[PDB]
Ligand binder design. Structure first.
Ligand SMILES: Nc1ncnc2c1ncn2[C@@H]1O[C@H](COP(=O)(O)OP(=O)(O)OP(=O)(O)O)[C@@H](O)[C@H]1O
Length: 135
């Protein structure tokens, strides 16, 4: 697909389903700041401060959390969801956002939050662009 211009992501949340002890708050902060700079540079600025950033465990936590987000944050544009490898959490996130609450979500692997590369950040930006782009 081609790149879309005129996306700005102002209202967004992080849900971290990776354990804190593996993916710590400095990991999250760091990853978010790198994401902030590459997306800005590509013309699709995601604001550096998510409206929400919490850790959760289990697919059972997903639906309560997302209903929480929907009910708390007007204008919420995106949930970025951090996953510890392979996990039923992925399917549940997609179930709830895609088919129940109509919430855009973008999943990301814990290893790519612990240690970012330009290429994986780009991959993410490109996926975000497609989702929030309107074409
Ligand atoms: N079964 C799974 N368990 C854990 N993580 C997964 C699983 N399937 C995919 N992922 C992770 O989700 C990330 C991308 O999720 P994303 O939100 O982009 O899905 P999607 O946009 O619905 O995919 P598609 O573009 O094919 O529809 C990838 O980095 C991948 O590692």
């Amino acid at each position: 697909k081609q790149f879309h211009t005129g996306i700005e992501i102002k209202v967004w949340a992080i849900a971290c389903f990776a354990p804190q002890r593996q993916c710590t708050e400095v990991h999250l902060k760091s990853f978010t700041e790198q994401l902030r700079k590459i997306s800005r540079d590509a013309g699709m600025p995601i604001q550096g401060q998510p409206c929400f950033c919490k850790y959760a465990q289990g697919a059972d936590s997903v639906e309560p959390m997302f209903r929480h987000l929907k009910n708390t944050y007007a204008g919420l544009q995106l949930v970025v969801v951090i996953l510890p490898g392979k996990t039923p959490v992925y399917a549940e996130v997609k179930r709830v956002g895609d088919t129940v609450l109509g919430m855009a979500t973008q999943c990301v692997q814990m290893k790519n939050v612990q240690r970012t590369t330009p290429q994986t950040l780009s991959n993410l930006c490109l996926k975000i662009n497609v989702k929030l782009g309107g074409v």
